[PDB]
Design a protein around this nucleic acid. Structure first.
Lengths: 71, 50, 49, 119, 126, 207, 85
RNA sequence: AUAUUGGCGAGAGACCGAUAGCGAACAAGUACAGUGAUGGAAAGAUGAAAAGAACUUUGAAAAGAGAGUGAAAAAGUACGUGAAAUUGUUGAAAGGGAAGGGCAUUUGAUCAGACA
RNA sequence: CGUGGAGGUCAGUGACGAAGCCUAGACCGUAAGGUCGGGUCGAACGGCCUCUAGUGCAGAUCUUGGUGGUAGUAGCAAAUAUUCAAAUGAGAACUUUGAAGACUGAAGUGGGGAAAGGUUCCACGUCAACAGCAGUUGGACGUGGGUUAGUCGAUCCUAAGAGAUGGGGAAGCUCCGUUUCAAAGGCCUGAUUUUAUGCAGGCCACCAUCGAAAGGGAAUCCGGUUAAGAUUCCGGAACCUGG
RNA sequence: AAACUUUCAACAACGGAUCUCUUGGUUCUCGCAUCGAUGAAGAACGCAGCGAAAUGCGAUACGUAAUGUGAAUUGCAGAAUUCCGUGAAUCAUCGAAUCUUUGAACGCACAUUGCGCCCCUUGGUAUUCCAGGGGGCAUGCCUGUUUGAGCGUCAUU
């Protein structure tokens, strides 16, 4: 997941099962004030929904990932 | 079945999370009668029947 | 951790005498099967070659 | 530790909802630290702090609606009594006390007297 | 003897209500008698044990030894007094469980509520 | 239970060589399947003649014969060679039957009543009990009958004024009214002559 | 030809999971469940199957609401709240 | 006034005591079998207290030999007591197509009683 | 005579060892059985007068559980076949790389999938059990990681057929019936300046719903990339439906 | 003669009998009447700092609030103020709340996490299109209201 941050300019989050692409695209924009190009989602085999969030080219993925703290 | 429905897939996620041995610290509690996992499933031996 | 690692190998031993190929082999052995012994074999079509 | 319930009961409605969001920022940041640490037992106390606020906001609105419908027939169904099913479908204390106008004249003139057999 | 109906004289009822007793009722079961020093002082025979009390062992292998209670361990119906231990062979130390019907209290720990308990039961304290 | 053993759908296999005719449990795969059921000799089967509740528990006895035996039980207490034959260390008291004054009835406490029982001469018969408590012999321990002991003197009173509560605690002693006079007390285990201490108002009522 | 070689042809499920009883007893072509009578309005049980009732009476599950009834009766179905005596 | 093998709360027994008693004292309507309706077991006990064997040396390791805890390792998580079938070592004895038994004594092993 | 309990008595026995179990050691009784010594053991148990029964086993092709003889025996013999050296290792006919040798021979022992299985795929640690020999290797064990779609499918339409409503039967759970002996339902503009919709006023007569991951069907391709994913991700280039 | 076969004892095995235990059953008696459209019983999935299960619980998820008791919980880690106190805990009680997706199951549908519609509202230059947030939409019957239908029928112009 850290390999996809740097080349892809992509964050990776875990999302509650009831949410869809319109709510991940809205909530990431609200919480971190960082615009989203596209959202991809899938359901893990253990039963929770993963979400691949690709930020726009203006916003960098490493610098937002330090503000939340995971690295 | 590679084109599975969600109702079947939700039950596979429960059978995966139950597919584990017993934790080591439950061995040490007071008045432990639990010795091994008696409800352990394996895909090889016993089919889970949907 | 080494004390609870020992308590795994003190309580695995009863399954290896029955040659359980996991801790999840609970295939139950039937005492008597019906199709072996419940019949009277005579002249004609029978239940096995 | 965490918040106390009786301290929240003095605050206004706008200050309770601001108290709730400030806890949820903490609870989101402790779940980031949970993968770095092998154990983080503090996340229980900030989690019950979310439950303690949501009880108070729910309690202050359910007490505000009872005053909106005090002194009025037909208050809503979840604010009425619960008691059980077959006791709600029953004769009230008024209706079972009713009796026809003929029996009212009988029971005044002839009630069960009080007496004793000794002398 | 028994002269009521609400009490039970059954062996299988009384043991099961002891071993599956809840935590708050295990406070009353683990009571400890006061010494004759304190019995003349307060005028009360028995008290439930608390953590900070000071105690003397009167029966067992540890007879005559005393100390302060480290922690009351209600899950085992036992109490672990400090400075009463078995030193293991590998240098570590293990406390020894005791039952508080054999302990004897020589110093009490008093809160507001411990004063309120003794005034309740007929005490004299001061 | 009436349905013990019959919670099974067993059925006979028929007549093979290598199997008996006792009806086997059907099905498969659990290890129970193929075992005998519904027999008295099978494991997990019912028993022979399941004991029903309507067995005759109580016995009707003739009333004139029941009054007869309570009369013969009283008249053996006087004889006092039978009393030593049953037990009852009464070799030191002068006369049998013992008659005590009516002030025995009006005693309120247990400590005073034992001192009354000592001074009449029932000292060792009280001490025959409390030396003789033992455990029950077998499985009657954990059927609420754990301890066993011997009996003691029996005190007969005319009118209750606190003697029945005073002697209620002290072991072995059983008090009894004159009008009742239980046969189960006067001859425990069908042996005549329990040692009986009479009171004076009770003794003249016996006419 | 009827035994072990034609057991190999068996790969089409007759039954699927039911919704009401969760039992895997829902016959597909009949659109109805053999165990719990779904979609009919009544739960299937019979007095010839006595063991089938003991597997599915009340008390066998969680009893989310009936476990708090007799506690409400013992107080007499009171309302309000405590007084801090 | 009467009924009641169900639900809830109680009290008791000349009852059974882990092949018994309910199928179930134990994570039992559970593991498991069947497409399905349904069928449905086995499984209690270290010690007062884990004080569950630090350390030493042989071994690749499991373990072994010592040391030690304990009142007791003839209680070491295969653990209260550990019977028989069946088996190992040692000791005695016999034996040409059986073995075992009855009456009677020899030889060999072994043993109680009484003599003040 | 013996067994499980019961009332009574022996102020019976017992941590200085109760019950049990073993005992080609002793004693009594014709016998059922009783008593004592020794060893093991660790907490309760007997004599006698009475009461009570779920009270005495060699068999029932008896029930459950356990163990023998046969016996280190029958056997592990289809599918052409293995060999040398080094590394790893306490240990290699079987693991790994290399050198040879052979086979399946494009209606395959190859490369993808549908039913079906459910984490077996991949990495790391590791060998008590399991792969009817072996084992350092595995589809085993322990811990983790991995499935990304406006275009591929489902969802949508109807087929043979399932099935409510209106109704009619049935003592009843439920049965027939699919447009029927039923008052079965909403669009299209206006005209407006209470602005929201009056009325303008026409047309329609059809009228549940479920039923195909192979029929019908709006629209995507190439080159890279992963320990494991791609017509789904990245880079590049297109097209379709609702606005 | 050894080996071997058989017999018995000693100690060691295999095996779990006997004896002693007991939070379980079993029958007998007494006291009481309390499930559900205010969504029951049942089911599915989720919840802990470290849990697979039993027990507990519903995105407020081994619990929140109120009250009583007044120092623990415990396998470990962690918290020391939370200890002469609006206050410990897997306690006791329980009168306030939450109550996921289902189920008589209720917008239609269900082998699908499918498909509509109405109102209130916020963002997208939008009454119409798309999305988020809140609230609704089953059938049978009764009483009442409102709008109607019929030359069933009466008066009135």
């Amino acid at each position: 997941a850290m390999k996809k941050v740097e080349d892809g300019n992509i964050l990776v989050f875990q999302v509650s099962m009831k949410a869809n692409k319109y709510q991940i695209k809205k909530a990431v924009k609200e919480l971190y004030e960082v615009d989203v190009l596209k959202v991809n989602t899938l359901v893990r085999p253990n039963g929770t929904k993963k979400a691949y969030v690709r930020l726009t080219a203006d916003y960098d993925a490493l610098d937002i990932a330090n503000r939340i703290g995971y690295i | 079945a590679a084109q599975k429905s969600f109702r079947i897939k939700q039950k596979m996620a429960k059978a995966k999370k139950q597919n584990r041995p017993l934790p080591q610290w439950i061995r040490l509690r007071t008045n432990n009668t639990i010795r091994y996992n008696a409800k352990r499933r394996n895909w090889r031996r016993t089919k889970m029947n949907i | 951790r080494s004390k609870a690692d020992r308590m795994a190998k003190m309580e695995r031993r009863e399954r290896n005498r029955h040659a359980k190929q996991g801790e999840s082999d609970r295939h139950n052995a039937v005492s008597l099967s019906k199709h072996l012994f419940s019949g009277k074999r005579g002249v004609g079509k029978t239940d096995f070659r | 530790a965490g918040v106390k319930a009786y301290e929240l009961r003095t605050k206004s409605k706008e200050q309770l909802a601001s108290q709730l969001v400030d806890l949820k920022k903490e609870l989101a940041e402790l779940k980031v630290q949970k993968l770095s640490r092998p154990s983080l037992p503090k996340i229980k106390t900030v989690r019950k702090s979310i439950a303690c606020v949501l009880t108070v906001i729910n309690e202050q609105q359910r007490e505000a609606v009872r005053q909106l419908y005090k002194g009025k027939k037909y208050q809503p169904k979840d604010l009425r009594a619960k008691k059980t099913r077959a006791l709600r479908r029953a004769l009230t204390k008024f209706e079972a006390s009713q009796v026809t106008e003929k029996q009212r004249k009988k029971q005044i003139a002839f009630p069960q007297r009080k007496y004793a057999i000794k002398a | 003897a028994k002269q009521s109906l609400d009490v039970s004289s059954d062996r299988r009822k009384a043991r099961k209500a002891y071993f599956t007793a809840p935590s708050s009722q295990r406070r009353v079961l683990l009571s400890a008698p006061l010494s004759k020093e304190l019995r003349a002082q307060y005028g009360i025979k028995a008290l439930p044990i608390r953590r900070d009390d000071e105690v003397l062992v009167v029966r067992g292998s540890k007879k005559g030894q005393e100390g302060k209670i480290s922690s009351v361990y209600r899950l085992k119906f036992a109490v672990q007094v400090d400075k009463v231990t078995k030193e293991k062979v590998n240098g570590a130390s293990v406390p020894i469980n005791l039952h508080p019907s054999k302990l004897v209290i020589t110093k009490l720990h008093l809160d507001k509520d411990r004063k309120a308990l003794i005034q309740r039961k007929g005490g004299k304290l001061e | 239970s009436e349905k013990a053993g019959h919670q099974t759908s067993a059925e006979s296999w028929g007549t093979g060589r290598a199997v008996a005719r006792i009806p086997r449990v059907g099905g498969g795969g659990t290890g129970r399947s193929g075992q005998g059921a519904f027999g008295n000799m099978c494991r997990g089967g019912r028993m022979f003649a399941p004991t029903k509740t309507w067995r005759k528990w109580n016995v009707k006895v003739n009333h004139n014969e029941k009054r007869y035996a309570t009369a013969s039980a009283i008249a053996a207490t006087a004889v006092a060679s039978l009393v030593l034959a049953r037990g009852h260390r009464v070799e030191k008291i002068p006369e049998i039957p013992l008659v005590v004054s009516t002030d025995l009835e009006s005693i309120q406490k247990t400590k005073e009543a034992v001192a009354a029982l000592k001074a009449v001469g029932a000292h060792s018969d009280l001490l025959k009990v409390l030396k003789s408590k033992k455990l029950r012999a077998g499985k009657g321990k954990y059927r609420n009958r754990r301890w066993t002991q011997r009996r003691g003197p029996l005190v007969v009173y005319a009118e209750d004024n606190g003697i029945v509560k005073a002697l209620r605690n002290v072991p072995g002693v059983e008090t009894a009214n004159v009008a009742s006079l239980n046969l189960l007390q006067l001859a425990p285990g069908a042996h005549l002559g329990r040692f009986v201490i009479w009171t004076e108002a009770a003794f003249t009522k016996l006419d | 030809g009827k035994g072990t070689p034609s057991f190999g042809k068996r790969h089409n499920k007759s039954h699927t999971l039911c919704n009401r009883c969760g039992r895997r007893s829902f016959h597909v072509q009949k659109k109805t469940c053999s165990s719990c009578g779904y979609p009919a309005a009544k739960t299937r049980s019979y007095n010839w199957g006595a063991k089938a009732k003991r597997r599915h009476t009340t008390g066998t599950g969680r009893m989310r609401y009936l476990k708090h009834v007799s506690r409400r009766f013992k107080n007499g179905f009171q309302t309000g709240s405590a007084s801090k005596a």
